[PDB]
């Protein structure tokens, strides 16, 4: 098994801001309730 664990980090909460500068806005807008 020892071999490149899950792709990149397994972060997901504090990591939001990590990806925020990428595909965060795409769903952020929608997950909110825009159009």
Swiss-Prot record:
Organism superkingdom: Eukaryota
Expression sites by tissue: Expressed in deep invaginations, inclusion cysts and the surface epithelial cells of the ovary. Also expressed in breast epithelial cells, spleen, thymus, prostate, testis, macrophages, fibroblasts, lung epithelial cells, placenta, brain stem, heart and small intestine. Expressed in kidney proximal tubular epithelial cells (at protein level).
Subcellular location: Cytoplasm; Cytoplasmic vesicle, Clathrin-coated vesicle membrane; Membrane, Clathrin-coated pit
Posttranslational mods: Phosphorylated. Phosphorylation during mitosis is leading to membrane displacement.
Domain comment, as recorded: The PID domain binds to predominantly non-phosphorylated NPXY internalization motifs present in members of the LDLR and APP family; it also mediates simultaneous binding to phosphatidylinositol 4,5-bisphosphate.
Primary role: Adapter protein that functions as a clathrin-associated sorting protein (CLASP) required for clathrin-mediated endocytosis of selected cargo proteins. Can bind and assemble clathrin, and binds simultaneously to phosphatidylinositol 4,5-bisphosphate (PtdIns(4,5)P2) and cargos containing non-phosphorylated NPXY internalization motifs, such as the LDL receptor, to recruit them to clathrin-coated pits. Can function in clathrin-mediated endocytosis independently of the AP-2 complex.
Subunit structure, interactors included: Interacts (via NPXY motif) with DAB2 (via PID domain). Can interact (via PID domain) with LDLR, APP, APLP1 and APLP2, and weakly with INPP5D (via NPXY motifs); the interaction is impaired by tyrosine phosphorylation of the respective NPXY motifs. Can weakly interact (via PID domain) with LRP1 (via NPXY motif); the interaction is enhanced by tyrosine phosphorylation of the NPXY motif. Interacts with LRP2 (via NPXY motif); the interaction is not affected by tyrosine phosphorylation of the NPXY motif. Interacts with clathrin; in vitro can assemble clathrin triskelia into polyhedral coats.
Protein name per the record: Disabled homolog 2
Parent sequence residues shown: 24 to 58 of 770
